[PDB]
Amino acid sequence: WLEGIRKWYYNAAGFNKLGLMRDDTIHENDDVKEAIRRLPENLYDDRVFRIKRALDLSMRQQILPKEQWTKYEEDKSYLEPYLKEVIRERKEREEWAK
Amino acid sequence: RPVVASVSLNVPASVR
Amino acid sequence: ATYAQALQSVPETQVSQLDNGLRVASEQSSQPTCTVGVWIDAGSRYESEKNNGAGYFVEHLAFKGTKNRPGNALEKEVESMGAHLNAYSTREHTAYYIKALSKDLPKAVELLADIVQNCSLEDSQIEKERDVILQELQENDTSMRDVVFNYLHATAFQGTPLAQSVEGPSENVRKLSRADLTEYLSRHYKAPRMVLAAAGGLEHRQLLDLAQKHFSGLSGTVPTLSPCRFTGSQICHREDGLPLAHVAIAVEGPGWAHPDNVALQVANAIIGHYDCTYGGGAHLSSPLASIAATNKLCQSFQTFNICYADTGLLGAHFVCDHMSIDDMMFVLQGQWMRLCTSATESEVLRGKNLLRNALVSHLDGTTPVCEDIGRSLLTYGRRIPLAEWESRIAEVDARVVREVCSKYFYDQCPAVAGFGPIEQLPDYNRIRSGMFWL
Amino acid sequence: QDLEFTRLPNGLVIASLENYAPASRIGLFIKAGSRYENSNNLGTSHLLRLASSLTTKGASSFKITRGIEAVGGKLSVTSTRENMAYTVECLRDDVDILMEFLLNVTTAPEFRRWEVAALQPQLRIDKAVALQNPQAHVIENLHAAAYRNALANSLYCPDYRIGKVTPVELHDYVQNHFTSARMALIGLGVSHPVLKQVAEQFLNIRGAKAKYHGGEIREQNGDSLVHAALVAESAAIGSAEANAFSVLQHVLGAGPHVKRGSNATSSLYQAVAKGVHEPFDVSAFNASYSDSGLFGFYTISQAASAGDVIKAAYNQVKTIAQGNLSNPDVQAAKNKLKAGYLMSVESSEGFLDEVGSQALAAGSYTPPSTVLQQIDAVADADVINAAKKFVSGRKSMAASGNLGHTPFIDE
Numbered sequence: 001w002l003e004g005i006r007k008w009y010y011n012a013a014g015f016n017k018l019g020l021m022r023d024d025t026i027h028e029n030d031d032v033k034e035a036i037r038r039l040p041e042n043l044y045d046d047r048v049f050r051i052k053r054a055l056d057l058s059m060r061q062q063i064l065p066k067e068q069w070t071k072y073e074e075d076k077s078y079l080e081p082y083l084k085e086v087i088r089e090r091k092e093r094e095e096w097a098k
Numbered sequence: 099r100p101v102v103a104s105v106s107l108n109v110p111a112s113v114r
Numbered sequence: 115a116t117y118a119q120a121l122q123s124v125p126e127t128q129v130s131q132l133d134n135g136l137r138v139a140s141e142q143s144s145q146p147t148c149t150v151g152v153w154i155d156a157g158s159r160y161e162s163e164k165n166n167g168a169g170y171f172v173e174h175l176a177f178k179g180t181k182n183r184p185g186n187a188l189e190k191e192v193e194s195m196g197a198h199l200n201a202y203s204t205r206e207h208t209a210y211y212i213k214a215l216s217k218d219l220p221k222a223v224e225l226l227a228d229i230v231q232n233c234s235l236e237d238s239q240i241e242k243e244r245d246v247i248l249q250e251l252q253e254n255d256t257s258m259r260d261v262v263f264n265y266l267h268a269t270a271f272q273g274t275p276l277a278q279s280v281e282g283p284s285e286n287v288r289k290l291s292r293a294d295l296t297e298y299l300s301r302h303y304k305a306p307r308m309v310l311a312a313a314g315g316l317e318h319r320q321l322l323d324l325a326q327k328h329f330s331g332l333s334g335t336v337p338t339l340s341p342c343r344f345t346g347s348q349i350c351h352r353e354d355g356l357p358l359a360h361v362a363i364a365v366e367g368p369g370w371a372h373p374d375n376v377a378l379q380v381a382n383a384i385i386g387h388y389d390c391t392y393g394g395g396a397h398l399s400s401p402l403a404s405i406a407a408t409n410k411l412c413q414s415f416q417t418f419n420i421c422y423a424d425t426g427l428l429g430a431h432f433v434c435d436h437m438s439i440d441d442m443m444f445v446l447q448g449q450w451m452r453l454c455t456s457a458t459e460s461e462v463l464r465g466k467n468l469l470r471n472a473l474v475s476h477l478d479g480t481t482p483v484c485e486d487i488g489r490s491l492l493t494y495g496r497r498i499p500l501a502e503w504e505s506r507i508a509e510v511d512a513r514v515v516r517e518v519c520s521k522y523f524y525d526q527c528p529a530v531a532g533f534g535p536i537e538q539l540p541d542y543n544r545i546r547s548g549m550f551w552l
Numbered sequence: 553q554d555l556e557f558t559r560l561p562n563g564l565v566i567a568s569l570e571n572y573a574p575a576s577r578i579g580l581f582i583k584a585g586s587r588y589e590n591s592n593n594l595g596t597s598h599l600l601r602l603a604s605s606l607t608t609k610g611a612s613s614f615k616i617t618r619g620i621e622a623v624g625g626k627l628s629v630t631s632t633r634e635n636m637a638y639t640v641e642c643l644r645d646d647v648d649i650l651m652e653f654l655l656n657v658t659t660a661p662e663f664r665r666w667e668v669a670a671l672q673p674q675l676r677i678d679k680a681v682a683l684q685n686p687q688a689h690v691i692e693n694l695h696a697a698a699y700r701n702a703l704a705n706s707l708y709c710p711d712y713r714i715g716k717v718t719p720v721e722l723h724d725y726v727q728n729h730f731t732s733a734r735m736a737l738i739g740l741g742v743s744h745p746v747l748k749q750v751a752e753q754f755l756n757i758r759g760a761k762a763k764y765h766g767g768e769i770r771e772q773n774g775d776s777l778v779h780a781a782l783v784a785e786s787a788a789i790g791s792a793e794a795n796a797f798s799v800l801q802h803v804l805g806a807g808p809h810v811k812r813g814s815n816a817t818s819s820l821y822q823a824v825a826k827g828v829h830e831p832f833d834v835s836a837f838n839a840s841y842s843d844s845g846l847f848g849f850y851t852i853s854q855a856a857s858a859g860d861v862i863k864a865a866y867n868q869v870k871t872i873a874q875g876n877l878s879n880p881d882v883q884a885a886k887n888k889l890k891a892g893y894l895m896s897v898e899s900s901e902g903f904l905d906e907v908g909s910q911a912l913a914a915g916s917y918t919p920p921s922t923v924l925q926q927i928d929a930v931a932d933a934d935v936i937n938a939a940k941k942f943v944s945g946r947k948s949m950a951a952s953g954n955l956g957h958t959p960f961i962d963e
Contacts, residue, residue, distance in 0.1 A: 106628035111391035193817040196887030397617035467624035
């Protein structure tokens with residue numbers, strides 16, 4: 001069986017212990033800088049405070065208590081809609097140029 | 099004069 | 115129906131000729147309106163320094179006094195007829211023309227004999243207009259675009275007549291005579307070097323009698339051309355006190371009859387144009403335009419392709435701030451060398467399909483039609499039908515362009531100009547060293 | 553070839569004129585001018601007029617920008633206080649593609665967030681290109697002075713509105729005004745059944761009056777030259793009374809038919825030529841909307857020579873209203889009118905500008921021949937209202953430049 005592992009591996013990464021999400025840990029390239037730039041303020045500002053505190057705890061090597069940890073079911077996919085939108089324009093930008 | 103606006107994708111902007 | 119079938123369905127023009135020498139032609143159409151004009155061989159190319167600017171001075175008195183309709187009586191009869199009237203001059207060609215209705219057309223042709231031939235040139239109006247001109251040479255200081263092309267033609271064609279302006283220096287306008295105009299009139303306005311043309315709801319034979327009526331009395335009986343050379347030279351009217359700097363650069367053009375002008379009008383459109391309003395912005399096709407919209411380097415630029423007898427001018431005009439000039443040129447040359455060497459076939463089809471909609475949309479009415487006719491009938495000889503313009507283009511491919519751009523862009527001796535805060539404007543040497551890739 | 557002209561049950565007009573020309577051409581005249589804007593949605597059409605070339609559902613902003621320039625067409629947008637046109641151009645061999653690009657702008661625009669934010673500050677540019685041509689804030693102020701609610705709203709956008717516009721604010725505007733009942737899918741260089749096929753598939757979907765008040769605005773801008781206008785409540789189109797002004801336009805002054813012409817036949821510019829010994833330029837002003845129109849003139853002069861000139865015009869019209877007039881000037885003025893109409897529609901574009909404009913105000917196209925007969929049937933006792941309505945009517949005024957010697961209405 002699979003689905004038990006995605007929950008499991010999600011616990012072994014550890015970033016659910018620093019109050020973070022899946023999207024926050026992404027590598028930044030020009031394709032994503034657009035997407036982040038496209039995000040709304042109500043959610044964008046909510047990105048930073050998640051990040052900003054996890055850093056301060058990575059400084060200390062500390063974490064948050066178990067209650068504040070992130071749950072797998074609440075690992076919202078808030079960023080994927082904005083993302084695949086971009087690459088739908090990238091691949092059109094290139095193949096059309098071919 | 100009876101002024102009218104005019105823009106485009108490739109016609110330069112204008113004012114009638 | 116289809117495109118190619120449409121071009122064959124066009125009214126094919128009709129040409130005539132007279133004993134005096136006056137070419138005449140027309141084109142019937144279903145338009146109830148009509149227009150007529152007189153495109154000729156005369157401009158500042160033939161005036162000397164003593165009579166420079168004169169042909170422009172002719173423009174302002176020809177409608178201000180005649181032998182049979184003196185004063186505003188001439189101007190009156192049009193407004194009574196309900197028509198417009200308009201005129202312009204160029205460095206080679208000058209044109210008077212009318213927009214009117216079909217039935218009142220015979221009254222029109224009767225005037226242009228009273229205008230062209232029988233101009234009166236009252237000394238009062240000679241002196242009044244002599245102030246009007248000097249009023250405008252103050253105005254054209256503001257017409258910064260017209261400043262540049264005036265400078266530009268004055269450099270590449272230096273020492274020749276063509277470096278002259280069209281309106282002329284203030285000095286000659288304050289020394290001009292009735293007689294120099296009489297001589298100027300007495301030599302250039304002649305049937306073998308003149309054209310009549312019209313379009314609309316008329317017939318070519320209604321017209322043929324009127325020319326045989328009125329202009330049959332024309333004097334049907336003259337130097338030829340000196341080949342106006344080309345120079346690669348720089349000019350720069352540094353002026354930091356302004357907002358921006360209109361800029362231009364160009365090279366030798368081949369001229370009218372040289373067929374590769376078809377190709378160059380594409381390449382101008384391959385690069386295209388942009389001015390601070392097109393919402394395409396980043397999404398545009400011209401890589402030049404996209405960058406200009408990306409970083410907001412410039413505010414406007416345009417290209418062109420002038421045609422003169424044995425030469426022309428190919429180049430561009432662009433307009434930006436003093437902290438962006440160098441990069442635009444680096445990108446601009448970055449496009450020319452690209453087409454000299456690496457021209458994608460699909461990008462050619464872009465411009466081939468730009469130019470079709472150019473000449474056609476250019477031909478929307480009657481007045482544009484007679485611009486072409488009265489111009490082609492002094493340059494190309496015949497008129498060229500639109501089905502013929504297409505067949506020439508359809509021969510084109512990227513193999514042609516790489517030969518043409520290599521012939522007229524690559525490593526040549528360009529001509530530069532500048533009027534504004536050109537503090538960043540590099541030197542002609544660096545510009546030429548940026549002209550050849552690698 | 554003759555001009556088809558139809559109508560669907562949904563109130564959606566179609567016409568078509570297969571002239572067998574090369575250049576296909578389509579224009580979608582719509583009632584979406586800024587008269588339909590309320591107080592809170594102002595400066596919107598100025599954005600919507602540029603909101604072309606943005607995301608759709610059936611396509612992206614990018615693809616449309618390239619898909620047109622491949623065939624080498626255009627996408628131009630005329631917009632009036634009444635209307636909002638999406639004109640295009642192409643060759644007839646590729647109409648089917650460009651059709652699809654159009655409707656996706658009007659039928660499935662998403663109006664997302666981020667593309668707009670980049671497109672807002674463009675308004676500062678476009679707003680200023682006009683006002684290099686100084687007429688376009690004088691003239692707006694007339695509407696904003698004379699009329700109150702709908703036509704007072706300028707085409708362009710105020711400053712403060714920038715950086716405050718909402719996309720939701722458009723969907724309300726779009727869903728209420730790009731509607732199958734008040735549109736006109738005109739075409740050209742194209743057959744009729746095609747357009748009949750398009751609208752039935754894609755366009756198969758579903759403001760106050762101009763209360764004249766009498767107002768006055770002034771703009772001491774320090775500009776060396778003057779610009780001014782005095783008007784009166786005119787009549788709307790359709791009425792032959794409207795043409796009575798449009799002929800009076802040519803009686804009084806219609807601008808230079810002649811390049812560098814002294815406009816001697818024009819009763820106005822002639823009337824100022826006496827006494828004055830310096831430059832000035834002036835002509836009749838005629839506007840004719842659906843609810844109403846406007847009529848008057850537009851002045852250019854120096855600072856000290858504003859009222860010295862206007863008090864010829866305001867007197868010259870009174871001469872007309874007092875019966876002082878001749879017939880050949882009228883028939884001359886008619887011949888001017890009969891000319892400029894045909895000369896305007898000589899071009900396909902200017903032709904197109906007339907076709908659907910009638911289809912919106914009216915529901916019928918009038919060929920030019922019938923127009924000339926209504927011009928033939930005009931009465932001098934109406935040309936008088938006419939000037940009597942102008943003089944006897946309430947007034948509205950505006951001007952700009954220096955105003956050290958500009959008088960008011962009552963002066």
